[PDB]
Amino acid sequence: VGTVKLRDLALERDRDVDAQGDLIVGKYAMGHGGLRPEAAGALVFSPA
Amino acid sequence: VGTVKLRDLALERDRDVDAQGDLIVGKYAMGHGGLRPEAAGALVFSPA
């Protein structure tokens, strides 16, 4: 399994005057996938 | 009678960029009530 990164975590603050409030936000961007099917497995329960 | 203040009068300004203007605001917070019933009265009219 592999991962590709474009951006990292960040925080930001802002103020609103039409509603008398405050704001906080965080964000990033990533992607995931699988590479080799011959290096994986699982253990399960037998059918009832 | 009495009065209780939590915040006092204040003013504030802002800038709007999507309508090309400015804003001005004023605000406060208060509450009112009565304390002593032995120092009050009223004058009225006779019925009918």
mmCIF file of N, CA and C in Angstrom, chain A residues 15 17-18 20, chain B residues 12 14 23 27:
data_model
loop_
_atom_site.group_PDB
_atom_site.id
_atom_site.type_symbol
_atom_site.label_atom_id
_atom_site.label_comp_id
_atom_site.label_asym_id
_atom_site.label_seq_id
_atom_site.Cartn_x
_atom_site.Cartn_y
_atom_site.Cartn_z
ATOM 1 N N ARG A 15 -12.441 36.646 10.972
ATOM 2 C CA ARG A 15 -13.524 37.247 11.741
ATOM 3 C C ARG A 15 -14.650 37.684 10.814
ATOM 4 N N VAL A 17 -18.185 39.992 10.554
ATOM 5 C CA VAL A 17 -18.846 41.147 11.156
ATOM 6 C C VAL A 17 -20.337 41.191 10.860
ATOM 7 N N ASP A 18 -20.798 40.549 9.788
ATOM 8 C CA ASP A 18 -22.226 40.507 9.505
ATOM 9 C C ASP A 18 -22.972 39.590 10.463
ATOM 10 N N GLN A 20 -21.202 38.589 13.700
ATOM 11 C CA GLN A 20 -20.560 38.743 15.007
ATOM 12 C C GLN A 20 -20.024 37.402 15.522
ATOM 13 N N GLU B 12 -17.659 50.143 15.979
ATOM 14 C CA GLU B 12 -16.781 49.288 15.193
ATOM 15 C C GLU B 12 -16.997 49.570 13.712
ATOM 16 N N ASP B 14 -15.784 48.394 9.459
ATOM 17 C CA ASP B 14 -15.382 47.287 8.603
ATOM 18 C C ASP B 14 -15.335 47.766 7.158
ATOM 19 N N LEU B 23 -19.155 49.689 6.936
ATOM 20 C CA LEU B 23 -20.219 49.415 7.896
ATOM 21 C C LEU B 23 -19.861 49.987 9.262
ATOM 22 N N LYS B 27 -23.589 48.724 19.998
ATOM 23 C CA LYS B 27 -24.243 47.652 20.744
ATOM 24 C C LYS B 27 -23.981 47.776 22.242
#
